[PDB]
Ligand SMILES: Nc1ncnc2c1ncn2[C@@H]1O[C@H](COP(=O)(O)OP(=O)(O)CP(=O)(O)O)[C@@H](O)[C@H]1O
Ligand SMILES: Nc1ncnc2c1ncn2[C@@H]1O[C@H](COP(=O)(O)OP(=O)(O)CP(=O)(O)O)[C@@H](O)[C@H]1O
Ligand SMILES: [Cl-]
């Protein structure tokens with residue numbers, strides 16, 4: 001089985017993975033850049049290897065160095081975390097071909113869900129609801145495209161299948177030019193000109209379903225998260241369960257997600273992201289990896305998602321059955337970033353003083369410590385503050401109180417932004433859409 | 443109802459109470475000594491009042507100053523925490539007579555359970571199992587006493603009803619002298635000569651049952667805790683549930699405890715302490731207050747014990763029914779003290795650096811912060827590290843890992859003692875008796 005794992009990541013998620021490994025008795029190899037020698041998890045790991053200089057391209061994205069680290073330590077498996085190489089199919093393929101277990105899905109599945117057109121096709125085949133669309137790539141025949149767009153109903157959005165690259169079209173007046181432009185933009189920067197159209201949903205929430213699937217033919221759904229509180233497509237606050245979603249609706253959408261996993265040969269943790277609008281779900285993407293906001297799911301289900309990843313990768317069955325899962329209570333997560341709370345410019349530097357919050361229903365997932373220097377080279381996340389309550393109101397109040405106790409001295413943080421969000425009367429009512437934070441911020 | 447609470451305590455429990463108050467929207471008054479101006483909860487409280495100089499006698503035990511604080515702030519209720527005045531019936535009486543709600547039982551109930559002979563009498567009346575004993579005070583008639591002692595079976599222990607004062611007798615040879623001595627010792631230092639005898643249990647565990655009782659006639663039991671890991675009668679590690687206790691046994695003893703609450707007119711949180719030996723429970727004391735180790739119960743039941751205290755004191759019913767309570771998983775607590783880990787001499791001074799642990803299943807209840815100075819004047823507790831796991835083994839491993847992440851720089855702590863305990867193969871098996879730690883320590 002898994003005796004030794006390379007943690008092919010950094011920051012909080014590396015520490016999260018280290019904690020799960022140490023609970024299971026799995027030895028750890030921390031691969032790190034020159035700039036991350038003082039990361040908490042590097043300091044706690046069984047073995048360490050420096051895989052390159054500070055820039056991500058030269059280190060955390062350095063496929064040969066990471067594989068070489070697993071080779072020299074005689075590791076059995078590599079955990080890619082989130083970001084970095086976690087949804088790089090070339091990496092997954094090379095890890096497996098080199099004799100290691102990739103803690104994630106197979107490369108073929110990564111590629112399948114990494115292409116929007118093929119992802120949507122598989123979701124439709126599996127009975128997962130999708131955005132009404134062209135259902136396949138669009139022609140050049142404007143007459144045909146004007147006809148599909150009319151069928152769908154304006155506004156529509158043109159999307160590059162290999163994008164990550166979009167264009168909203170609100171009238172037929174614009175369509176021909178728009179489809180051509182998006183085709184050309186996608187072909188030069190992504191060497192792939194394939195685009196499709198789908199309905200542009202103007203008032204949606206981001207609701208995403210957590211799954212696990214093992215090598216024993218099982219697949220489970222673990223309720224959902226609402227991640228609508230975002231700026232510039234970057235999440236700020238997440239919660240679980242999603243307000244307004246009943247157990248009956250959860251069973252319906254969740255079971256479809258679980259069947260999709262089985263149809264596509266999925267293995268490990270993943271998330272189906274939906275836009276949720278006027279009471280209906282519409283698939284937009286599958287993240288084929290663990291996610292930042294996994295803790296809110298753990299809080300309301302009792303599941304340890306990273307431990308299950310490791311089990312599954314070792315060849316074990318998921319450690320419970322669907323009937324064992326019951327949503328209990330409510331959870332909130334605030335992503336605490338080293339950044340200016342109004343300009344959102346990063347704020348690297350020495351944390352002179354850290355005071356972290358605690359007590360009943362308060363969880364703190366962070367690699368930051370007093371005396372730690374937040375480097376410039378990576379993202380600005382320094383901590384995830386997670387609260388639990390028997391109700392959403394309690395979770396929210398607990399989050400407010402925990403934030404008020406939190407002290408991070410030496411750098412700016414976005415704590416003031418979280419405080420503003422949590423006291424917002426619309427957020428307190430629940431169910432705001434994905435545009436709310438930008439609208440509120442002006 | 444309760445709009446404003448005086449927190450008549452300090453340290454971690456004061457902060458625990460402050461957190462519960464703030465979640466409920468209850469304003470807080472922090473009464474503190476001159477030495478505790480920089481306590482975390484004093485800094486967070488709505489109002490503060492200095493009630494005396496450093497020594498406890500002059501501050502936290504200063505009944506007129508505490509009552510005066512409630513008077514001047516127009517407070518509604520006083521929470522005594524644990525220790526200090528929490529089981530002082532004179533205090534409870536004066537709080538109520540002065541027009542405030544005492545967050546605890548009535549004085550008459552405090553006094554009743556504060557006297558061993560009357561406590562045992564009430565427990566027997568209620569069907570709670572007690573240590574076989576003289577069942578009432580012992581005479582001077584040695585013939586009668588030798589007869590009771592014989593009935594009970596040596597060894598016996600002679601105990602002052604007002605003690606807190608004991609003497610073990612292993613043969614009739616010693617009995618007459620022993621009963622006389624304990625009588626005289628109790629009369630001079632406690633102005634009460636009343637003593638009884640009971641069986642001395644040589645191989646017991648400390649197993650205690652948590653209850654709540656409200657002013658609506660309800661009383662619930664919330665499983666039990668095993669607090670056998672102690673030195674010199676001071677707890678080091680506690681856990682819940684107690685190893686070896688089945689749900690059927692739990693229902694039996696728990697229901698008897700709940701009926702006792704109703705018979706005696708109990709109100710609030712309390713704990714029935716038992717010695718548990720060869721599969722049987724024997725009552726030794728009721729703590730008529732919240733306890734240090736309350737968190738392990740919260741972790742395995744989902745109950746917020748301090749919030750329920752406040753509800754009950756406001757006149758509300760307990761917020762759930764007995765059938766709603768189900769033990770889930772296992773929890774451990776390590777009392778982290780500022781003391782030398784081998785001599786146990788206190789270690790006051792400045793915490794230069796604090797790094798607290800986190801992640802899934804890790805709870806940290808502490809008022810300590812980097813830059814905080816641990817004073818000499820009070821107890822040496824600085825933090826409670828609490829873990830949860832689906833099994834006892836997981837709780838234990840999580841505790842080990844959390845301790846390894848914990849850094850308290852500037853003072854000595856008992857972390858090395860906890861590490862030694864957690865890796866002990868007998869502790870890992872579970873069920874060690876109250877003498878084990880002293881035996882292990884040599
Ligand atoms: N049919 C549709 N209607 C309305 N909005 C849509 C939409 N399809 C996609 N979007 C929005 O387009 C935005 C950009 O998607 P994006 O390019 O970020 O994909 P991505 O998930 O691969 C990168 P990331 O998830 O990190 O932001 C998303 O916020 C999504 O909400
Ligand atoms: N019948 C009995 N047989 C064996 N041990 C007994 C016993 N009765 C009491 N003890 C032990 O005597 C010890 C001392 O009790 P103690 O005097 O501390 O009462 P107490 O609870 O009011 C003060 P604390 O709880 O803070 O130690 C306890 O550890 C208890 O385990
Ligand atoms: Cl993510």
Ligand SMILES: [Cl-]
Nearest residue numbers: 524732733734
């Ligand atoms: Cl206590």
Ligand SMILES: [Mg+2]
Nearest residue numbers: 273285286287
């Ligand atoms: Mg996405």
Ligand SMILES: [Mg+2]
Nearest residue numbers: 715727728729
């Ligand atoms: Mg006691």
